[PDB]
Amino acid sequence: IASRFFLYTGPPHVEVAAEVIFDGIPGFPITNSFVVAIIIDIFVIALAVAATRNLQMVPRGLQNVMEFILESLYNLFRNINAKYVATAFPLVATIFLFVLFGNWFGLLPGVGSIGVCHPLSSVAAAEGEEIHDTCAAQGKKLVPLFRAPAADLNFTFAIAVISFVFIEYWGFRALGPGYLKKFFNTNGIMSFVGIIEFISELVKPFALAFRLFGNIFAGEVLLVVMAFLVPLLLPLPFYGFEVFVGFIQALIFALLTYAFLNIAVT
Amino acid sequence: VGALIISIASRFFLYTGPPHVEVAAEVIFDGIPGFPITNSFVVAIIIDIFVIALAVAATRNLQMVPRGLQNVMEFILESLYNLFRNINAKYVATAFPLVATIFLFVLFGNWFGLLPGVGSIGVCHIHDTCAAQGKKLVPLFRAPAADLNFTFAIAVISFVFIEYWGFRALGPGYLKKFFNTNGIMSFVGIIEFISELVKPFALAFRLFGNIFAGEVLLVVMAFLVPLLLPLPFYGFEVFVGFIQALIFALLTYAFLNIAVT
Amino acid sequence: ALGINPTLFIAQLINFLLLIFILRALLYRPVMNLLNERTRRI
Amino acid sequence: NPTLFIAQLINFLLLIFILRALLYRPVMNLLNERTRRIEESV
Amino acid sequence: EALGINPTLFIAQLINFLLLIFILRALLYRPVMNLLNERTRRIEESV
Amino acid sequence: GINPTLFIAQLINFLLLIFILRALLYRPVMNLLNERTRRI
Amino acid sequence: MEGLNLVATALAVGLGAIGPGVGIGIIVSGAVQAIGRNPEIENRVVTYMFIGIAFTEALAIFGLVIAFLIGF
Amino acid sequence: MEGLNLVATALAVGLGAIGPGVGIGIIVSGAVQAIGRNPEIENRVVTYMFIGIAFTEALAIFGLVIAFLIGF
Amino acid sequence: MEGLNLVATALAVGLGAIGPGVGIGIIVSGAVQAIGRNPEIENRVVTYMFIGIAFTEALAIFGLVIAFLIGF
Amino acid sequence: MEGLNLVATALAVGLGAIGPGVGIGIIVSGAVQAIGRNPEIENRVVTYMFIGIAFTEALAIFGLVIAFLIGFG
Amino acid sequence: MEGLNLVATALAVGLGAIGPGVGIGIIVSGAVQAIGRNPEIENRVVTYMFIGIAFTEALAIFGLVIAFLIGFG
Amino acid sequence: MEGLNLVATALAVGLGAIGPGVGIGIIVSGAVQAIGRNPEIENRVVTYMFIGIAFTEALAIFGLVIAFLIGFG
Amino acid sequence: MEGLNLVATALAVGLGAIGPGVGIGIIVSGAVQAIGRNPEIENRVVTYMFIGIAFTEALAIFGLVIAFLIGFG
Amino acid sequence: MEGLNLVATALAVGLGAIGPGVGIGIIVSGAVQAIGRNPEIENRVVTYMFIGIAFTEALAIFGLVIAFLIGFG
Amino acid sequence: MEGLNLVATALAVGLGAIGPGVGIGIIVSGAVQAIGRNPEIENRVVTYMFIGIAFTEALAIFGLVIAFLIGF
Amino acid sequence: MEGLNLVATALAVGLGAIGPGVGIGIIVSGAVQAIGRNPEIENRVVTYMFIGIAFTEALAIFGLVIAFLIGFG
């Protein structure tokens, strides 16, 4: 147990970079985040059609788990506000299901190991290995074809802005001219606190996007660093923490979206 | 007395000069071929003489009903005995003389530091008196607890006392504690051991630093305004001297109690 | 640094909208109807 | 990566084994309880 | 003689000590004597 | 202030103090306290 | 001397994490307590708790934003 | 040097985040607990909590204004 | 250097936000909890709370005016 | 001087651990005490504790990400 | 390097204001809670609250005046 | 100018001990206080206490990872 | 540096006035809350509070004395 | 720089005493309060207290190890 | 780098005042609260209260002693 | 440059004192409150509180001995 943490075969360094533009031979260039986002959308749609093509009483199998999770989500959102528990359910459900599998994809082997490129080799007496990668030729960087979709500041930014637009539209849906009455109403000191409220409302989607992107990117970076430190028998607790926190943040995004919706409508 | 005190600006007429009192060690009082007499050892002898005099005066008649000085002497011993009985039951008799002495001696040492002239009266080896001559000025009547040697001595004697009376009370068990537990008292035991090792260090340092800070505070407040400014500080320090004395006594008794139990 | 690509940003927004529509059309409406049937006719 | 991929695969396999040993009986039991409740409701 | 005397410091220390004694007599004199008298009375009555 | 002879002498003086007051400030006072408690 | 902008960004983000983090912790602890001894007021208490968390996060995001402006 | 202004702005914003953040956190926790203990006084306690929140955030607003003045 | 003044005023404003911010937070939390406990003494407790608020804000104004003298 | 980047990374990560470290502890202590007092209300209490932990941990992640960008930018 | 005087004045005033502010806050919170618990003792409560407030303000005044001495001659 | 790497490693370790240390202390104090008043809720409270302990330890691991990264470059 | 003396005096003042202020605030708040119930203990609780306030002022005046010594050699 | 290696160990040990010190203090305070409330749960109380103490001491051990590594090289 | 010893003394005394000061404050507040709740337990409480008071002051005195050694 | 050892010793001692002081303060406060509530469990209360204060003082002593090794050697 305490004699099998060999470091002779491991990554040479800890590669850290932002979203890397993929080759993009045709027009409208794509990146490594868009392809994985599309493949996760495909997986989600496949699971949806599998749970949909066979719908009946006494659910069992994939359909049972899907219905259980969906009813748990309805119960969780109903605990906040039952007025819009169904009118806004598809958005939060889709965002949650996409983010959960996006965070899960980062744990798949090959993420950061497969490169598209647009023992003795390891350094001795050092805790980190120095085995050169396959793409080390041409002075390349071994661009990761598979990357966590939420580890990119574009998918998170897009879901944040779509959530903000949905929340603002649903609030303006039934509120009359009441938004302005809550922002700088010029009634004593309520105007100043309304100004802070407006600023916070404006900065909420940016905060959400940055939080999710940073969380997932930091998870991937810490996994890479732990792999560099010791190839195996080190990162089991950290992998478990990452797999927990990915789904946790995925549910958090939807819950915060619903909470902001309720706090805007009320 | 009105709050519109005018004498607050006496520093122009009465300038004490910089706080030359910054010595962290002993200065010889009298030139003797043998061991030197420190400014702290002389006051220690004076305090021993004072304690002997008060004891003999309060026990010369041994009057049944205590009156005058007899009641004053009896009250402090009664309070200490009640406190120690509250802490421990059967070890009051065993340690009462040592803890009472270590209380009274350092209490009188702390109180002597606030005596006027302690920082002013001295022997030649703004400009004081000696600096006018070629010989430098060293102070007179330096507090005993201000000397690190005396505090270290009382700390080490307290450590010897507690170790001896823990060993005698608990047999071989106290000598090696319970290191062989290996389940809990294997990492806690060494931590308690180093705590015991530093216990005399902390005990001596408490008194030494407190008294040093007291004297330097008195000198500093004299430097800033030598009139009505150091009165609250003087009151605070005469209070804190007795407080530190009682703290040392109660603390060593409690350490003995935790050692035996 | 940030890697903020406006083209990729609009592409991600369109993909998210399409995913939301697909999810609303499949396994959301149907699962909701199934749950309502299992709850309103239990 | 010739070496990082192997470490990632080993870590993923160990995590999957741990989840199956620990975090697989509870989800299955919850699903079975939900199915039994649904069957009772019918 | 070999006496080291600081004129301002000595006078200031004497003044401060005298004022401290005055404030102690004004405040911390009634309770200390009162507790002494209470102890004396309790012991004397215990005969 | 790390002179061995001086703090050794201080230790000697403190031990002499405790052993000289045991017989004059403690023994008479302890005997009086014991008798007074025994008197009630 | 190297770029002090890195140290500035580090200090800004670090203190923005230091303060609002404890603010959110205290807010959430109090909200959970008030829910525990009184579930009937959960809607209003969660609304006010979310307002407070937004204000704390508003301060934290202000710190992050000025840190980013310093960085670029 | 060159980055002294950036360090100053970052430090000011960070401290103005750490102080008022904990302040508003404690304010919201206390207000939520009081509301849970007494729904009837909710209007008054909410008004006073908002006043305290404004003052606490007024401090942070002063900090941010000073940082922007140094930056500008 | 030629920028130490900016660092000074920034630190002064930041700590003036640090201290009185937490002071205000604790004051308002305690006052609101007491008001929820007993609404009848609301006037007196509000008066005392405002006095404490002014004292903390007096400290904050001292710090801010020191920064103003340094900055200006 | 020369190696200020490492100092910045360390300071950012350290304070990011400092703040949310206390926040998460306070949240967990409060949630556990509330659950112990009222075991039946944990159904929403646990979720609220988790969503509160989210906001705290977000700041630590911000610090860690900023430190990573500094050390690798 | 001559700005060290301004740096010192600012550090002195800020770190001498941060402590007394928290102290006054806790003092007033406790005093208000006690007044709510028992309005009849408000006289002595306010007296002791003012004593503590003065002590904190005494510390703050010391910090401010010595910062003034640093700033001036 | 050159030994700043050790300073950064030390600062990272120290503050990543500062935060999670207080977090774990508060978590354990709250957990034991709750467990004192409700013996049978131990199974429920232990899970949440361990989750919070791990999250604080997650922050500590962040700090240690950064310290090791700057410790070895 | 030539101006380190002023910064040192400021730090010895400001850093020395933080903990004592919070301790004074906590002491006074606790004493007031305690005197809220059973006010007859006022004498003893005030005595103990004054012992505590003396210790806090002891630390604060240690800081002040060190600052004054540094500012004037 | 000639120095900066003593300063690193100093900061590391200081902050590793800052964090775990308060953590252990709060742990012990909660434990004694729970023991006073519930005497006969002492075994579980002590067990959980020691687990929390070990988890807190992990950070102090890390800090001491880092300080020793810096000192030895 | 003259004056470094003065800054060292300042930092040591400042932190030694910060820590044990709050420790003493907490100890005294807890002691007076317990005494107010149960006056009879004072005779057994004050001993341990002073034990803790001495234990807290140990670190502050350590700081002061180290500061003096640095200055001398 | 040359006085960095003195600053290292001072920072080590101060930081190692700042934390454990508050830790033992909260320890003693909790122990006193528990003693006031229940004097019968006092023996176990005192033993556990002394174990905890020994732990915290061991942390402070680690800081002090590190500072001593920094100053001398």
Curated annotation (Swiss-Prot), chain C:
TM region(s), chain numbering: 2-22
GO MF annotation list: proton-transporting ATP synthase activity, rotational mechanism
Location in the cell: Cell membrane
Name recorded for this polypeptide: ATP synthase subunit b
Homology family: Belongs to the ATPase B chain family.
Keyword entries, A-Z: ATP synthesis, Cell membrane, CF(0), Hydrogen ion transport, Ion transport, Membrane, Transmembrane, Transmembrane helix, Transport
Subunit-level organization: F-type ATPases have 2 components, F(1) - the catalytic core - and F(0) - the membrane proton channel. F(1) has five subunits: alpha(3), beta(3), gamma(1), delta(1), epsilon(1). F(0) has four main subunits: a(1), b(2) and c(10-14). The alpha and beta chains form an alternating ring which encloses part of the gamma chain. F(1) is attached to F(0) by a central stalk formed by the gamma and epsilon chains, while a peripheral stalk is formed by the delta and b chains.
Subcellular location, principal: membrane
Function: F(1)F(0) ATP synthase produces ATP from ADP in the presence of a proton or sodium gradient. F-type ATPases consist of two structural domains, F(1) containing the extramembraneous catalytic core and F(0) containing the membrane proton channel, linked together by a central stalk and a peripheral stalk. During catalysis, ATP synthesis in the catalytic domain of F(1) is coupled via a rotary mechanism of the central stalk subunits to proton translocation.
Gene assigned in the entry: atpF
Swiss-Prot record, chain E:
Keyword Transport recorded: yes
Subcellular location field: Cell membrane
Family: Belongs to the ATPase B chain family.
Keyword check for Ubl conjugation: no
Function (record text): F(1)F(0) ATP synthase produces ATP from ADP in the presence of a proton or sodium gradient. F-type ATPases consist of two structural domains, F(1) containing the extramembraneous catalytic core and F(0) containing the membrane proton channel, linked together by a central stalk and a peripheral stalk. During catalysis, ATP synthesis in the catalytic domain of F(1) is coupled via a rotary mechanism of the central stalk subunits to proton translocation. Component of the F(0) channel, it forms part of the peripheral stalk, linking F(1) to F(0).
A GO term from the CC aspect: plasma membrane
Keywords of this entry: ATP synthesis, Cell membrane, CF(0), Hydrogen ion transport, Ion transport, Membrane, Transmembrane, Transmembrane helix, Transport
GO molecular function: proton-transporting ATP synthase activity, rotational mechanism
Complex and partners: F-type ATPases have 2 components, F(1) - the catalytic core - and F(0) - the membrane proton channel. F(1) has five subunits: alpha(3), beta(3), gamma(1), delta(1), epsilon(1). F(0) has four main subunits: a(1), b(2) and c(10-14). The alpha and beta chains form an alternating ring which encloses part of the gamma chain. F(1) is attached to F(0) by a central stalk formed by the gamma and epsilon chains, while a peripheral stalk is formed by the delta and b chains.
Superkingdom as given in the UniProt entry: Bacteria
Stretches that traverse the bilayer: 3-23
Organism expressing this protein natively: Chloroflexus aurantiacus (strain ATCC 29366 / DSM 635 / J-10-fl)
Residues of the full protein shown: 2 to 48 of 164
Record's protein name: ATP synthase subunit b
Swiss-Prot record, chains G, H, I, O:
Major localization listed first in the record, in broad terms: membrane
InterPro entries: ATP_synth_csu_bac/chlpt, ATP_synth_F0_csu, ATP_synth_F0_csu_DDCD_BS, ATP_synth_F0_csu_sf, ATPase_proteolipid_c-like_dom, F/V-ATP_Csub_sf
Subcellular location, record wording: Cell membrane
Site label Reversibly protonated during proton transport, positions: E57
Keywords: ATP synthesis, Cell membrane, CF(0), Hydrogen ion transport, Ion transport, Lipid-binding, Membrane, Transmembrane, Transmembrane helix, Transport
Transmembrane regions listed in the UniProt entry: 7-27, 50-70
GO CC, alphabetical: plasma membrane; proton-transporting ATP synthase complex; proton-transporting two-sector ATPase complex, proton-transporting domain
Domain of life: Bacteria
Mode of membrane association: Multi-pass membrane protein
Any GO BP: proton motive force-driven ATP synthesis
SUPFAM superfamilies (alphabetical): F1F0 ATP synthase subunit C
Single annotated GO MF: lipid binding
Subunit structure: F-type ATPases have 2 components, F(1) - the catalytic core - and F(0) - the membrane proton channel. F(1) has five subunits: alpha(3), beta(3), gamma(1), delta(1), epsilon(1). F(0) has four main subunits: a(1), b(1), b'(1) and c(10-14). The alpha and beta chains form an alternating ring which encloses part of the gamma chain. F(1) is attached to F(0) by a central stalk formed by the gamma and epsilon chains, while a peripheral stalk is formed by the delta, b and b' chains.
Cited function: F(1)F(0) ATP synthase produces ATP from ADP in the presence of a proton or sodium gradient. F-type ATPases consist of two structural domains, F(1) containing the extramembraneous catalytic core and F(0) containing the membrane proton channel, linked together by a central stalk and a peripheral stalk. During catalysis, ATP synthesis in the catalytic domain of F(1) is coupled via a rotary mechanism of the central stalk subunits to proton translocation.
HAMAP family per the UniProt record, alphabetical: ATP_synth_c_bact
Family affiliation: Belongs to the ATPase C chain family.
Protein name: ATP synthase subunit c
Organism this protein belongs to: Chloroflexus aurantiacus (strain ATCC 29366 / DSM 635 / J-10-fl)
